[PDB]
Amino acid sequence: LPPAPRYFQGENTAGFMRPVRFEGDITNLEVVGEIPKSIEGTFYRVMPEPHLPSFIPNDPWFNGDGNISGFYFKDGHVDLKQRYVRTEKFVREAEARRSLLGKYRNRYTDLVEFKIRSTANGNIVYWRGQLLALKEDSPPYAMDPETLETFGVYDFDGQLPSLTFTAHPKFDPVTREMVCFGYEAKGDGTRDICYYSFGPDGKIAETVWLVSPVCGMIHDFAVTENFVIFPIIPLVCDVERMKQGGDHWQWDYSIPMYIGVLPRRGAQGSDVKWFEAPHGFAGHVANAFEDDKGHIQLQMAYAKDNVFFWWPDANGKGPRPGEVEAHFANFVLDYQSDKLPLAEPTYLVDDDMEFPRIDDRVATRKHKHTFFCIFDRKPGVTDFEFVMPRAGGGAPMSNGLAHLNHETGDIQRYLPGPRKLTGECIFIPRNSEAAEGDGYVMVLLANYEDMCSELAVLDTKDLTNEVALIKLPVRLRPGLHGNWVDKSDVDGHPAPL
Amino acid sequence: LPPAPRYFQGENTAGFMRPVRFEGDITNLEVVGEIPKSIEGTFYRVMPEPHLPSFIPNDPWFNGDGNISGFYFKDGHVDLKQRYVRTEKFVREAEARRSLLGKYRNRYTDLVEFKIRSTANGNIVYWRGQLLALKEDSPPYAMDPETLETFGVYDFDGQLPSLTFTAHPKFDPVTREMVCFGYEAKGDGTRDICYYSFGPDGKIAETVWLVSPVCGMIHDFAVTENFVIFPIIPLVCDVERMKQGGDHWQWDYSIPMYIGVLPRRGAQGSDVKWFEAPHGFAGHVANAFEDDKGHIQLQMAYAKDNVFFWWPDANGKGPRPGEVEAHFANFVLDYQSDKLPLAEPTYLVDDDMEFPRIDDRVATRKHKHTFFCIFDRKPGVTDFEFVMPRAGGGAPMSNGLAHLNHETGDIQRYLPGPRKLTGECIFIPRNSEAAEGDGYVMVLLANYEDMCSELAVLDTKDLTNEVALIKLPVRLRPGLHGNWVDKSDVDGHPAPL
Ligand SMILES: Oc1cc(O)cc(/C=C/c2ccc(O)c(O)c2)c1
Ligand SMILES: Oc1cc(O)cc(/C=C/c2ccc(O)c(O)c2)c1
Ligand SMILES: Oc1cc(O)cc(/C=C/c2ccc(O)c(O)c2)c1
Numbered sequence A, B: 001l002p003p004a005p006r007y008f009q010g011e012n013t014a015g016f017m018r019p020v021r022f023e024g025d026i027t028n029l030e031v032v033g034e035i036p037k038s039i040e041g042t043f044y045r046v047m048p049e050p051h052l053p054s055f056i057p058n059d060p061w062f063n064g065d066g067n068i069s070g071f072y073f074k075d076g077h078v079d080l081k082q083r084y085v086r087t088e089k090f091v092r093e094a095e096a097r098r099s100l101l102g103k104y105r106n107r108y109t110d111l112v113e114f115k116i117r118s119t120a121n122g123n124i125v126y127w128r129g130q131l132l133a134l135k136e137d138s139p140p141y142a143m144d145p146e147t148l149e150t151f152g153v154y155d156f157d158g159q160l161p162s163l164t165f166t167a168h169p170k171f172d173p174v175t176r177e178m179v180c181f182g183y184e185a186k187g188d189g190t191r192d193i194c195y196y197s198f199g200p201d202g203k204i205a206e207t208v209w210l211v212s213p214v215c216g217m218i219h220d221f222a223v224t225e226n227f228v229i230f231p232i233i234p235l236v237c238d239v240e241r242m243k244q245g246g247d248h249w250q251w252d253y254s255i256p257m258y259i260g261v262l263p264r265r266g267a268q269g270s271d272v273k274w275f276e277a278p279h280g281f282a283g284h285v286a287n288a289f290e291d292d293k294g295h296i297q298l299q300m301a302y303a304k305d306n307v308f309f310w311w312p313d314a315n316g317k318g319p320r321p322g323e324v325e326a327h328f329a330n331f332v333l334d335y336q337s338d339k340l341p342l343a344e345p346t347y348l349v350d351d352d353m354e355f356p357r358i359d360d361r362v363a364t365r366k367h368k369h370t371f372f373c374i375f376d377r378k379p380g381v382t383d384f385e386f387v388m389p390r391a392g393g394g395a396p397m398s399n400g401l402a403h404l405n406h407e408t409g410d411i412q413r414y415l416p417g418p419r420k421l422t423g424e425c426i427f428i429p430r431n432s433e434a435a436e437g438d439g440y441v442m443v444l445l446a447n448y449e450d451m452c453s454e455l456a457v458l459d460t461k462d463l464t465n466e467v468a469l470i471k472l473p474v475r476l477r478p479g480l481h482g483n484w485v486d487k488s489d490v491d492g493h494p495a496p497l
């Protein structure tokens, strides 16, 4: 076998990116300021965190074993519980005490044959009394919300029709449906997309098989009252390249950014329309909704080049680190239109941004508040001379949050400080009567001065001010998505506005 | 109640002394170099680590909740398990989410009435299939060696005759007895010492009640073939002072360092002889043995002033931090002598030292190897300008280990580096046939550059060289005692030479 390294090496595991790999508990976290006593619930987040050194050099951040953090809040006190998802990969590698899974989404490089290759490191959502740890090449892994025990691969009582389940299902706050899809839904290199949904009772509702024009990456999607929308990143998969040891994904500069639109209920596969947006990178969706005219307003991060620059085109053409900005775009789509090309989007703000969140009580409907990460290159905002030697590589950087009020156009910006960076935020309604976007924002900070993590609590009345700063004595490696599960919500999801 | 702080403040919890308070697992620790594959067993150590901020300002290091680390070795791989002892204090404070126990060994300052005030933070030893977490004001807490679960207060099947059990029992390698005592054995301020022992079958053997000349601190003791030996630190307890909120301990410059000698088997309390060594501080015992003449050679750390300077005399007189050195002393005692005053000891080395270990296969018998912590003020050995601002306070500092060969007088010194300090080492026999003092030494390092801990593995053939350096991504706060439990030893203790 290729030798197994016994310590981590390379920039992707240096500095603040160095794996800690702890599982367990830290109760009664230290708090500067005061956590509002009325906050009750749990912030779950997932980070990629390799449990064992990879035999693949410069293994991407996206390929690390998913480790779940839960921050449990009650009466102004907070406890941390942390545990790895017991994926097939995690368990077999733990047994062997060495890495066995190879390159990202390339089974031809694995040292053993895996049935499930999930690292379960994309998202951690709540559904019908379980956590689901998501990874878009795999079914979910189900976990216990209280103990973070892994139950195992979850197939929705034998109903799951797809080999793959998106990291970005949407929760309809009115119907209480979980709306889902998977791409490469019949395995490596397949252009099959399976669109499917589950009612609040756990029974499958929709199942529609459609066909993508290319085998392209569909990381996120959007859901409106009457439509589902599939933006395709121009990363394309060729299995013959993979069999020779090559990358799953390769940029294609010659294609549009396809945006498929399908009727949400009762459709056939042939009902999809593949609109063609200008070439670019489909980032995370804030939210989509139908306006008065029945037109889809799709609000999402959008870049004009390959954000995932480590997967360039066939000739190695692509951007350098830190070069590509994504902007908060609005696309207008009309399902009734026969014109496939779409105009350039309008932009809601100037900021280099990503990881947009809304008040999910209006998900799939018109929203007027968005919270998002920003990266401001303006001199002084980040002390790069101090931070970059301590940062490692392989993960995106955010040096603030912004709150856009879409009606007034007012923006507030939270800057944690020149030697701190942020992850994706969560929004918490102040209470069950709170107006849209009124409540608390929490975000995990990397503090490069202390080389510790912190959890900031902000009030939406003034996003510039920390109400509380929870001071962890360990590092939580930069992670991906996370979710709030409020104690007042019996099914784990907030009530509609 | 006095207010409960919600974050740690003061020098005793600053820098590397800041509590982490993690419990759980980190498997497959990163390793630089190579752990000898034949090493099989577990290194257990205990640190004081306050679970909650104290309502007592500048609470001493000795008053922190005991947290147990286990480093489990097999086939050159190592896993960490970490868990707090579930003392009465730990559990009640966890339930309340605030500190309730008050000043060190002063129940009159507690916010609730405790039955057992143990922090179980002094030592962690193996006995008849359990760990015993020791604290000299209390009985032991029994724990599971594999899971570190706490079973509860341990009273040896109802046989424990004393309220108190020393942090420093001795294991006789020939008889397989655990030889024990407790001072203040009938409660606060009592001069009762209870000497007791347990045979390898768990049955109590000796129980002898004796009377100390003063109510002084007897932190450690020594055992030979035919005698047990009780050195008294001139810290003295007055319960009336304690009832007014004063300190348990107060130095007395007017008394000798008493050294009691009692026949090991069949004695009455009146058989003790209280020899009178020159005034000074009784540090940790390396080992004691009887020579050819039947005279006791007692080898221990010994200082000429109050090492515990935060407990000065009645008029507040005593040394400053970093002023008092302890030296490796040899005292000669003759039980048959009627002369009580003892000569000044001879000194085996000149180093400022503490935390001596021997090859416990010759415990209670003549030894010719000692391993110990040293603090060398020689320019450059420690980079104080870098270290001291990051160090915090309240704990002793060691910047190397030394190995003394008592026959040849040769000393080897291990220096981890200018920005690292050490804890107490353990010795591991190379194998069951190894000569005395031949095998491995392990020691936990504080790395102030990384603000991480590391576990160094040394071969006694050359103590200056690390064969392996195990790199923890967290800090383990400076701790006290620890022990090796070898897999090849059925009763957890090594076979006699
Ligand atoms: O030694 C082996 C051989 C093998 O062929 C499979 C396994 C483990 C399978 C597994 C363990 C945990 C999971 O969560 C999961 O999806 C799969 C272990
Ligand atoms: O900074 C960004 C921006 C973005 O729009 C998407 C991502 C992550 C996508 C992803 C893609 C494949 C994976 O396997 C995975 O875990 C995550 C990260
Ligand atoms: O009056 C009370 C009230 C209470 O809420 C708890 C206790 C004691 C609990 C305890 C828990 C664990 C231990 O190991 C132990 O010795 C004691 C006593």
Ligand SMILES: Oc1cc(O)cc(/C=C/c2ccc(O)c(O)c2)c1
Residues within 6 Å of the ligand: B062, B121, B122, B136, B219, B282, B283, B284, B301, B307, B354, B396
């Ligand atoms: O650096 C030193 C030198 C020494 O000779 C003894 C000690 C520790 C003694 C101790 C005394 C009382 C306690 O309650 C406790 O946990 C520990 C520490």
Ligand SMILES: Oc1cc(O)cc(/C=C/c2ccc(O)c(O)c2)c1
Residues within 6 Å of the ligand: B377, B378, B379, B380, B381, B382, B383, B384, B418
């Ligand atoms: O006359 C003295 C007395 C003393 O106590 C220390 C020094 C110098 C210390 C030193 C010099 C160089 C270093 O790199 C370093 O860590 C420490 C000089």
Ligand SMILES: [Fe+2]
Residues within 6 Å of the ligand: A122, A167, A168, A219, A284, A480, A481
């Ligand atoms: Fe995502």
Ligand SMILES: [Fe+2]
Residues within 6 Å of the ligand: B122, B167, B168, B219, B284, B480, B481
């Ligand atoms: Fe001790």
